């Protein structure tokens, strides 16, 4: 029994990326291929006193 601001499964795990990106900022035009090496999850925020 508990209450959480958002499910703890996100805090414990992540998602594997997939697909293909878009255009680049500069240089030869190309698109990279996504794979399981990319992880989508929550971030970490630093905070001073």
């Amino acid at each position: 029994t508990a209450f959480v601001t958002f499910p703890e499964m996100f805090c414990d795990w992540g998602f594997a990326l997939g697909g293909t990106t878009g255009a680049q900022s500069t240089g030869t035009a190309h698109t990279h291929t996504l794979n399981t090496d990319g992880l989508a999850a929550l971030q970490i925020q630093i905070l001073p006193a």
Binding site: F3, V4, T5, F6, P7
Partner: protein
């Protein structure tokens, strides 16, 4: 003594009668209230309760 005992038994029966009626009303109202209230959706699942 016989009439006194009958008086006492009738008073006991009336006490049992009122207690049972009050208990029935309380139990039914408690069940109705429990059914009306209960689980509510958390903040993240939806905005409204």
């Amino acid at each position: 003594s016989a009439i006194s005992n009958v008086i006492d038994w009738f008073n006991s029966l009336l006490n049992f009668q009122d207690t049972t009626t009050s208990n029935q009303i309380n139990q039914q109202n408690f069940q109705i209230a429990t059914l009306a209230s209960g689980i509510k959706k958390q903040q993240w699942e939806c905005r409204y309760s």
